[PDB]
Every structure is written in C-alpha cells, then in structure tokens.
Amino acid sequence: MQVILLDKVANLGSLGDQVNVKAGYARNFLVPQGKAVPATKKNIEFFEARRAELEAKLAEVLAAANARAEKINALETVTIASKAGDEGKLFGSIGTRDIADAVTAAGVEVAKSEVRLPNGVLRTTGEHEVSFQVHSEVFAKVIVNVVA
RNA sequence: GAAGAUGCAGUGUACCCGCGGCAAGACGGAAAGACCCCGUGAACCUUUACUAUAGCUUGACACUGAACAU
Ligand SMILES: [K+]
Ligand SMILES: [K+]
Ligand SMILES: [K+]
Ligand SMILES: [K+]
Ligand SMILES: [Mg+2]
Ligand SMILES: [Mg+2]
Ligand SMILES: [Mg+2]
Ligand SMILES: [Mg+2]
Ligand SMILES: [Mg+2]
Ligand SMILES: [Mg+2]
C-alpha cells in the first residue's frame, strides 16, 4: 500500500514522504491514528499544495509538548497515599490512573496514556521514578512518593 | 400308466335314499416351499474387499501489523 506520511514515523520517514507499507500497517494503525493517508491522486496533489501549514501545525504541537513537559519537570515530586503493611509493602498498588490524577490535582494535566511506569505498577512505600511521554520524542519525569 | 388309480385293463362285489358315529384315502382344506438350487434379484450386517466421503489431523496463502537479536 502506498501512503503519504503526515508526520514523523520512526523507521518510516518524515512528513510528506511516499512509502510502501504493508496493508495491515496502514489499515489498522497509520490511517486511524492520523499518521498517514492513502496516496491517491487527490491527496497527493492536495497535500502538495497544503503542506507548509501542517509543517506549522507540527511545530506548534511539538512546542506545546515542550511547554507541558517543562511544567511536569517543574512539579518535581508528587506524593501518593494508600494503605500498607508494617513492612512498607502495599496490599494493593499504584497504577497510571491514580498517578495521573495525582499529577492532575498537583497542577499539570496528564492522561493515563502518557504515564510510562517502566517496572510496572508501584507496590512498595517510598520514592520511585516514573516517566512521562507527552510527545513522540519528548520525555518528562516525576519523583513519586508513596506513603501509608 | 408322467413311475402310489373311484374314473385305464381284467376281474370281483353291489337294489334306491337318509340319520348317528369314526377318520384309512380323495397325494383332503389352508399359505404361488421358509429347506435346496437358480436370477450377472433385494435388503441389512462385517471387515486389513474396491471406490468415495463427514469428522479428526498437517502445511501454504488470506484476514495479518511494528521493532530488535540470531
Ligand atoms: K375295470
Ligand atoms: K379320512
Ligand atoms: K456376476
Ligand atoms: K430386511
Ligand atoms: Mg395301484
Ligand atoms: Mg354319514
Ligand atoms: Mg373326529
Ligand atoms: Mg393339500
Ligand atoms: Mg413357488
Ligand atoms: Mg448385494
């Protein structure tokens, strides 16, 4: 399948390219996500005349991602509370939904999809390092404090 | 004598007709022998008979994509 990339897609190419992908890749991911469109005469010529304004829509989104990230980096540490045993080990756990709400209430608004807990959910009291991904290339960070 | 005769030949016996009884024969009545054979007949059953086939199972392609390592 021939498609026209509407953004930077890693391992594929940059905005405006014309690449041959497997049909399933385009059908179930690139096109529904908005990352590409089928390379039909119209699209090709329309995207050719309509290009530099998308290049300005991308840099607007990339900067907006840079601005929200600096705010997340500005919260530094966010404390979360729960119940635990005496050995500090939680009975339940701490996932994305409640880390996101914690950062939301602490100021910066983050969705659960942006949280990236590397070592899974948090199941012990103390301080852990979680990461945030607000853009496909930028990456924020936050120290999370878990107390009983 | 189609080979076990009321009906043919020879011969013997025998007036015509009921009724109560008995079953030796009319190869008695009943059912186009079920046994046996035959038909290039039938059915259902069996199986390492033949040919197929549901099912079960194998791989290729499609629905079906992204990275990295070897
Ligand atoms: K006579
Ligand atoms: K009799
Ligand atoms: K035959
Ligand atoms: K039968
Ligand atoms: Mg005689
Ligand atoms: Mg009498
Ligand atoms: Mg009697
Ligand atoms: Mg008889
Ligand atoms: Mg007969
Ligand atoms: Mg037969």
Side-chain angles (χ1 to χ4, degrees):
Chain A
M1 185 163 181
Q2 294 288 332
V3 286
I4 293 147
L5 306 180
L6 287 214
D7 202 326
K8 184 26 204 173
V9 168
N11 281 277
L12 211 49
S14 287
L15 159 84
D17 215 314
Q18 259 177 118
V19 56
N20 182 72
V21 296
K22 286 181 174 334
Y25 195 17
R27 172 188 311 121
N28 299 315
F29 191 60
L30 297 176
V31 165
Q33 296 288 346
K35 301 165 139 94
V37 294
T40 90
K41 293 179 179 179
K42 293 179 179 179
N43 319 15
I44 301 158
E45 63 73 51
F46 159 61
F47 174 85
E48 195 47 56
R50 181 177 181 170
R51 200 189 209 270
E53 293 177 350
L54 301 114
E55 262 151 282
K57 260 302 307 283
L58 263 67
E60 142 179 335
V61 174
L62 175 130
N66 299 299
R68 193 188 295 159
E70 290 171 5
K71 288 182 19 53
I72 292 167
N73 272 318
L75 287 193
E76 292 193 354
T77 303
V78 176
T79 297
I80 315 200
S82 49
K83 92 294 172 193
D86 298 303
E87 291 319 293
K89 274 203 277 72
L90 308 168
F91 293 115
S93 191
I94 300 307
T96 88
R97 174 89 290 271
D98 56 313
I99 286 179
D101 302 333
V103 180
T104 289
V108 207
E109 216 292 297
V110 176
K112 54 170 71 133
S113 53
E114 313 209 287
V115 200
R116 315 241 156 299
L117 311 111
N119 43 71
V121 316
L122 304 185
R123 287 227 174 70
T124 44
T125 52
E127 296 206 336
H128 309 251
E129 287 313 333
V130 312
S131 148
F132 290 79
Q133 179 179 353
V134 267
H135 191 267
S136 325
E137 302 238 1
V138 82
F139 283 99
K141 204 166 316 323
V142 140
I143 320 98
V144 189
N145 193 52
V146 171
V147 292

